[PDB]
């Protein structure tokens, strides 16, 4: 209750709708390999190749 409106309702709905909580921005432990996908996708404008 430190800050209140909308912040309180999110205490439930951020658990009660998992699709809100699912994103690729996970708590990643796999840092020894998952960085080796991103450093090739690390480009400003790119194509299907």
């Amino acid at each position: 209750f430190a800050n209140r409106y909308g912040y309180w309702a999110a205490n439930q709905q951020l658990r009660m709708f998992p699709e809100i909580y699912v994103d690729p921005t996970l708590r990643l432990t796999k840092t020894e390999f998952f960085f080796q996908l991103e450093s090739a996708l690390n480009q400003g404008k790119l194509t299907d190749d």
């Binding site: 209750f1 309702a9 439930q12 709905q13």
Partner: protein, 78 residues
């Protein structure tokens, strides 16, 4: 599902179980400052509940004016 009431009741049923007793004021004051979980009307009134400062006046004065009645000093004087 969530509402202004599920926010309020998550406070109200939480404060009830703050039980420490004896001579201490806290519940004595809160019950002297009387209001209840079903104060008046119903929860769908909210849009018409929009009101000025005038809402406060009877919460102070409406107990205060009882002093002449309580002390027995006067009654017919409105």
């Amino acid at each position: 599902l969530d509402s202004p009431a599920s926010y309020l009741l998550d406070l109200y049923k939480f404060i009830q179980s703050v039980e420490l007793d004896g001579s201490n004021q806290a519940r004595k004051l809160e019950t002297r400052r009387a209001d209840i979980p079903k104060l008046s009307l119903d929860n769908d009134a909210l849009y018409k509940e929009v009101t000025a400062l005038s809402i406060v006046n009877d919460v102070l004065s409406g107990s205060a004016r009882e002093y002449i009645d309580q002390s027995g000093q006067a009654d017919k004087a409105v």
